[PDB]
From TrEMBL, chain A:
Protein name as catalogued: Ribosomal protein L3
GO CC term (a single one): cytosolic large ribosomal subunit
Taxonomic lineage: Eukaryota, Discoba, Euglenozoa, Kinetoplastea, Metakinetoplastina
Native organism: Leishmania major
GO molecular function: RNA binding; structural constituent of ribosome
Pfam families: Ribosomal_L3 (PF00297)
Binding site for Mg(2+) 1: 263
UniProtKB/TrEMBL annotation, chain B:
Family listed: Belongs to the universal ribosomal protein uL22 family.
Protein name (database record): Putative 60S ribosomal protein L17
Keywords: Metal-binding, Ribonucleoprotein, Ribosomal protein
Binding site for Mg(2+): 128
SUPFAM superfamilies reported for this sequence: Ribosomal protein L22
Pfam families registered for this protein in UniProt: Ribosomal_L22 (PF00237)
TrEMBL record, chain C:
Pfam families per record: Ribosomal_L13 (PF00572)
Family, per entry: Belongs to the universal ribosomal protein uL13 family.
UniProt entry keywords in alphabetical sequence: Ribonucleoprotein, Ribosomal protein
Protein name from the UniProt record: Putative 60S ribosomal protein L13a
Length: 401, 151, 221
RNA sequence: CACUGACAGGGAACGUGAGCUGGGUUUAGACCGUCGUGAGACAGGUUGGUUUUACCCUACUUAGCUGGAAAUUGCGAGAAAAAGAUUAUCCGUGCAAAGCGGACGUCGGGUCGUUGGGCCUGGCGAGCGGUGGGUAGUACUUGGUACGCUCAUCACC
RNA sequence: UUAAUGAGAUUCCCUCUGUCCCGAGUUACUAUCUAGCGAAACGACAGUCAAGGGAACGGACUUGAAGGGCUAAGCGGGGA
RNA sequence: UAAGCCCAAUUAGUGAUUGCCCAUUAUUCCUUUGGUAAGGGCGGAAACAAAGGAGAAAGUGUAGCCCUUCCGAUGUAGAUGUGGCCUGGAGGUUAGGACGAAGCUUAUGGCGUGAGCCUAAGAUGGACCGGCCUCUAGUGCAGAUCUUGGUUGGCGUAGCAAAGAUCUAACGGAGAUAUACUCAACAUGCAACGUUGGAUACUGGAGCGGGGAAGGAUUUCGUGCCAACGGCACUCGUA
RNA sequence: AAGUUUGAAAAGCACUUUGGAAAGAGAGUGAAAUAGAACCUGAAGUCGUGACAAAGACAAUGGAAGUACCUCCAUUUCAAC
């Protein structure tokens, strides 16, 4: 007989199976549609999640109750060291899908990029790309590279560059990995020849995050969510908890199916892996693209807040540390923990909404300690509050004596 | 009185043990892994299994036993560290080595050519179940025979 | 597909030349789906190696909407408790033809699967089949002899592109390029063909006369 | 009774008890009414009244290892490849064009055999390069790479 | 009819609360992995489905659809 | 331009009346078996050494006297027949066995439609026993929630989770610090026992404290001892 | 419940060697030691091992007809045959 009352089913069947992601890096399954009238450009970038904070800004949304009013917005800080372009790949359209025509490698590859080809680099022979480097600049090698580029020009419809992260630039102590993360970044805009020209110019060169993205634009984020291991139906799917009197346990689904069909269906909630799934999140507004702290110290200083401070809160980001490189401040949250590498992608949805076209101007960035209830924005304010302490006085006595 | 005959008797050494009192299945797994090994490599393997740096691969008697990363060297996923079987097999290997030395052979050149673990006659005990039931609580000893030949 | 290094080393040791098995290439353009499928299935069971091209140009009798609805009714069939391992609904025209032939075969025996693996189906004519020899048709399964011309008919590619096939435009562009290239190559070699025709014409006079009379007897000169 | 856009109707062994619960029905105790001489009866009312087992196989959920196109074998040779002394005898560009633009050489020698024969190898030089040293001035997120000249070797030779 | 008494049946009220809205976090012992030890129940043969007929609800049969092999932890839809 | 429906046909206004596929059916051939079976032969025709042959029984039934000729052969319950098979004994009669009897084993062949029989080989066994006629019966197993004994997948699985707990050094013990080469040690002898000293904890006098009854009956004590038992362990023990 | 039914005879395995012992490896008695002690024979079932046959998933088994490979088996031929 029919179920007595109606409620929506628990969970989304389009995110099945709830298995662990094959990779730990966010990888863009698709890229934004290619527009041949636009200038050639890069469509993605790799960043590392540092932590979260919140900002204050005045809203410019006419017709809203917060129009010309200040709101507090939680934001995510993502460290964005420059990426290095080491290869070019071309794709040809076939009636069975895109097939990569070939690869053009840069003449010189970083040690970090070549570490990606080893499980134990420091005890290896470190011979990666050695034969290729010898062959590339000979007559036959130059001919082969020209031939591959000509094949790209004639047959390719998609041009992607091979880029890797720079973990030496990301001088992070909690990021343990030293082998660079490698990903393909599609080149959109212009003709195939213009894409080839841009990719050739970018070869063996750094790409900064502000070249790919601009402030107040939105972006897509590809990342893997935080892992939780095996979980029950209550947390994995959101099913209700059974009454207290239930024999053999109440954190269960009471009926996992009818008598017929005489088997469990794939639509029934079961225990299993929860978290560590790849997710593509849409319309993350870019509130700030900050420069490196070594170049511009006052990262978190606004026009409305003249306090000279960096984007790193007091005591550092918990479990991550300080942000030493360029960073992106995304509105809201992104899937994954701190230290996980993530892919910012140019948006694939239309960007014509009043919220997606709003110009963001920050008025305050919180840099108080994320350990405990932080109440000082800078160390200077804390010293103003406390004055000289016993340790400082002992220090000054040791100095003057 | 072995199931198999050595290729060259004068170059081989035999060792046997009956009613070992170790578990037959664990000993079956432990002794089978050294078949075809040099004697010294088998003894190193047993020492490293005692140290828990290498495992005994469990085949045919691995029903719902745990998975380990140390079974990968054997092409398996389930292995254990059965110390009683390991020490019993170490004693048996020492006896075979003593026989080889007394015959005049070189213990560093011997290769284990035959291992056979068979179930011995069982020993009977009891366990007490609910509702006044008495139920068998049995022990499964094993026979182990081996010979190794000089190469 | 990619040969093993063992196979290449053995071929080098044997030193034998390039070998191509006897394969019939069928141009399935303007062919009735079921009749071509039946003929091809029988020929596969008889041991023939068949490659079929331009499967997007197969024909089904009836309006395109009726056949779209038939395919969508086919797509409704799924294992409810697990759609994975349920019926697999292939949307490409070549896959549709392969499925039709497979349904006309004893697919659950070694003999039937041997027959099925002997069939290669393409949309359009790919480069590895363009220059392999003259393509054949099936006279008893051709549209101009099977359908009364008044009645509407469906082109398989048009139906497939609306039931989920993604490569309609890719196949169209590839076929445009292929026909342009083949037309260029056929406008060329015209001098060669005319030269051979005139060579035969002049040979008709340069050869001994009783041979010419023999050719005239059998309708050759 | 009250919200709501609406509070549609049904099936799945009258879905679903080794999923629960056990209020009801339907044991044994007991009370009432009626019936019966009685023991007792009542699809009449009332109160109290043990809810056992998965470690097997499938299904489902996740989680690992691993071969395989003659779906393990045949040696049983099919490219969503190139386009040529039958892919062999160079490389680009051009439309499977017309044409066009480029290729390191010298002097021997140690074998197998139309054509300035094929294969291998020595002596000199020449180049495009790799790997190090010496020395500039730059570029790049600024410790690490590259680029200019000059030696050293090494590979194509 | 009845004060008092009741592990007796019932209704309401104050207080109080994770009974619930609506679940979350933490602990010990398990499960889980290992060493040693080591059973039982059950066991025709065996175990992917749809529909058909059929002793009128098939794992075997017909016609189709699936199905590479072997494993660990769970689970209670089926094994009437 | 059916591979649908209704009519027609058999290579097509050409010259006559069988397109093709499939049965345990029909026809025919071979073989078996049984008849309400039908007949022939059976008084050895004559001749014939080794260095054409063999048989020929007056018969229900056999390896059926022999030959020829017809007809029928499925079948639950059930009946009957069988010079039909098999088992333990008894009268007889023929054999066999230490140069290997019964039992047991089999890719071990042969014969029989079959029940079965016989041979071969045991790198099996070590002392009985086979064939035929008759007599006799505690005379043939796949299943009875069959009886007894053994084995077995489940399965190294469920589990061995109440009563808070053990640590450390030394001594004892075979129970270790146990290694082929390369070699400082860790990455190759682990884990586990008893006693003593320290430490830590629990019982908390309605005690895992001292004594008795009932019940038990040597469990008491010392020495030795570790096969089995104390569901892990033991060098300890109410063994 | 249970034949102590080893062997003709205890001739019941001295001695060497490894092992703490149990035992093992040799040696020895015996016609036999898978006749080594509650030991004549030693079945079936189940299990171990070496060698070989292969083999997807059609549960397996099964019939009929072939074929590939093997065969410590049975016959028949090897010359005016
Ligand atoms: K219901
Ligand atoms: K119910
Ligand atoms: K039915
Ligand atoms: K049915
Ligand atoms: K047996
Ligand atoms: K066969
Ligand atoms: Mg409803
Ligand atoms: Mg619903
Ligand atoms: Mg975590
Ligand atoms: Mg309960
Ligand atoms: Mg905090
Ligand atoms: Mg378990
Ligand atoms: Mg397990
Ligand atoms: Mg118990
Ligand atoms: Mg009791
Ligand atoms: Mg109903
Ligand atoms: Mg119901
Ligand atoms: Mg149920
Ligand atoms: Mg229940
Ligand atoms: Mg009740
Ligand atoms: Mg009365
Ligand atoms: Mg009641
Ligand atoms: Mg009652
Ligand atoms: Mg009372
Ligand atoms: Mg009371
Ligand atoms: Mg469990
Ligand atoms: Mg364990
Ligand atoms: Mg079904
Ligand atoms: Mg069933
Ligand atoms: Mg169930
Ligand atoms: Mg009968
Ligand atoms: Mg008798
Ligand atoms: Mg056999
Ligand atoms: Mg009887
Ligand atoms: Mg029997
Ligand atoms: Mg078992
Ligand atoms: Mg367990
Ligand atoms: Mg435990
Ligand atoms: Mg328990
Ligand atoms: Mg406890
Ligand atoms: Mg130790
Ligand atoms: Mg205390
Ligand atoms: Mg206490
Ligand atoms: Mg206390
Ligand atoms: Mg007391
Ligand atoms: Mg014990
Ligand atoms: Mg008896
Ligand atoms: Mg002797
Ligand atoms: Mg014997
Ligand atoms: Mg015996
Ligand atoms: Na026509
Ligand atoms: Na065997």
């Amino acid at each position: 007989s029919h179920c007595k009352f109606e409620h929506p089913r628990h969970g989304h069947l389009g995110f099945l199976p709830r298995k662990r992601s094959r990779q730990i890096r966010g990888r863009a399954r698709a890229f934004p549609k290619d527009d041949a009238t636009q200038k050639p450009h890069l469509t993605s970038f790799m960043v590392f999640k540092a932590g979260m904070t919140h900002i204050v800004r005045d809203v410019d949304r006419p017709g809203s109750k917060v129009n010309k009013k200040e709101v507090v917005e939680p934001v995510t800080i993502l460290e964005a060291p420059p990426m290095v372009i080491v290869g070019i790949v071309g794709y040809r359209q076939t009636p069975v899908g895109l097939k990569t025509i070939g690869t053009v490698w840069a003449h010189h590859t970083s040690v970090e990029f070549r570490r990606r080809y080893y499980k134990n680099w420091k005890q290896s022979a470190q011979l990666a790309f050695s034969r290729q480097k010898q062959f590339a600049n000979t007559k036959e090698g130059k001919v082969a590279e020209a031939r591959t580029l000509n094949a790209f020009a004639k047959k390719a419809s998609v041009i992607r560059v091979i880029a890797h992260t720079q973990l030496r630039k990301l001088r992070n102590h909690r990021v343990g990995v030293k082998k660079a993360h490698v990903q393909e970044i599609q080149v959109n805009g212009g003709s195939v020849a213009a894409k080839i020209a841009l990719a050739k110019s970018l070869l063996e060169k750094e790409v900064r995050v502000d070249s790919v993205f601009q402030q107040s634009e939105a972006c897509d984020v590809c990342s893997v969510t935080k892992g939780h291991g095996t979980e029950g139906v209550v947390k994995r799917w959101g099913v209700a908890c059974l009454p207290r009197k239930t024999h053999r346990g109440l954190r269960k689904v009471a009926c996992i199916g009818a008598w017929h069909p005489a088997r469990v269906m794939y639509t029934v909630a079961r225990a299993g892996q929860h978290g560590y799934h790849h997710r593509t999140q849409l319309n993350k507004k870019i509130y700030q693209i900050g420069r490196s702290v070594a170049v511009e110290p006052n990262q978190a200083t606004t026009t409305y807040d003249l306090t000279a401070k960096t984007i790193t809160p007091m005591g550092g980001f918990v479990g991550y540390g300080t942000v030493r490189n360029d960073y992106v401040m995304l509105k809201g949250s992104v899937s994954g923990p701190r230290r996980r590498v993530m892919t910012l992608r140019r948006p694939m949805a239309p960007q014509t909404s009043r919220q997606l076209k709003e110009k963001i101007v920050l008025k305050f960035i919180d840099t108080s300690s994320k350990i405990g209830h932080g109440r000082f924005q800078t160390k200077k304010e804390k010293n103003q509050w406390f004055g000289p302490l016993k340790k400082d006085r002992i220090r000054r006595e040791e100095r003057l004596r | 009185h072995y199931s198999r005959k050595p290729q060259v008797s004068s170059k081989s050494a035999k060792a046997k043990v009956s009613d070992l009192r170790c578990h037959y299945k664990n000993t079956f797994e432990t002794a089978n892994v050294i078949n075809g090994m040099p004697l010294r490599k088998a003894q190193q393997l047993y020492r490293q299994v005692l140290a828990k740096t290498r495992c005994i691969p469990f085949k045919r008697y691995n029903g719902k036993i745990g998975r380990t990363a140390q079974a990968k060297e054997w092409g398996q996923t389930k292995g254990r560290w059965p110390r009683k079987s390991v020490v019993a097999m170490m004693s048996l290997l020492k006896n075979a080595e003593a026989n080889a030395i007394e015959k005049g052979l070189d213990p560093n050149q011997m290769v284990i050519k035959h291992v056979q673990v068979d179930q011995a006659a069982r020993m009977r005990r009891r366990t007490y179940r609910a509702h006044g039931r008495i139920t068998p609580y049995m022990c499964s000893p094993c026979h182990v025979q081996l010979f190794m030949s000089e190469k | 597909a990619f040969p093993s290094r063992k196979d290449a080393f053995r071929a080098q040791r044997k030193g034998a030349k390039k070998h191509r098995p006897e394969i019939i290439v069928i141009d399935l353009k303007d062919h009735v789906l079921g009749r071509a499928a039946a003929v091809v299935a029988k020929q596969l069971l008889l041991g023939k190696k068949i490659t079929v091209v331009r499967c997007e140009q197969l024909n089904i009798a009836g309006t395109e909407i009726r056949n779209k609805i038939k395919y969508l009714q086919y797509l409704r069939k799924r294992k409810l408790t697990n759609p994975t391992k349920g019926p697999f609904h292939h949307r490409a025209p070549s896959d549709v033809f392969v499925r039709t032939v497979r349904s006309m075969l004893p697919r659950y025996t070694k003999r039937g699967m041997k027959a099925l693996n002997s069939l290669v189906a393409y949309e359009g004519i790919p480069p590895n089949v363009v220059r392999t020899g003259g393509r054949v048709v099936i006279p008893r399964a051709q549209r101009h002899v099977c359908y009364r011309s008044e009645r509407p008919y469906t082109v398989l590619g048009n139906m497939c592109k609306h039931v989920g096939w993604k490569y309609s435009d890719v196949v169209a562009n590839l076929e445009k390029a292929r026909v342009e290239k083949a037309s260029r190559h056929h406008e060329k070699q015209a001098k060669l063909r005319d030269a051979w025709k005139s060579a035969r014409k002049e040979a008709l006079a340069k050869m001994p006369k009783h041979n010419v009379e023999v050719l005239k007897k059998f309708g050759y000169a």
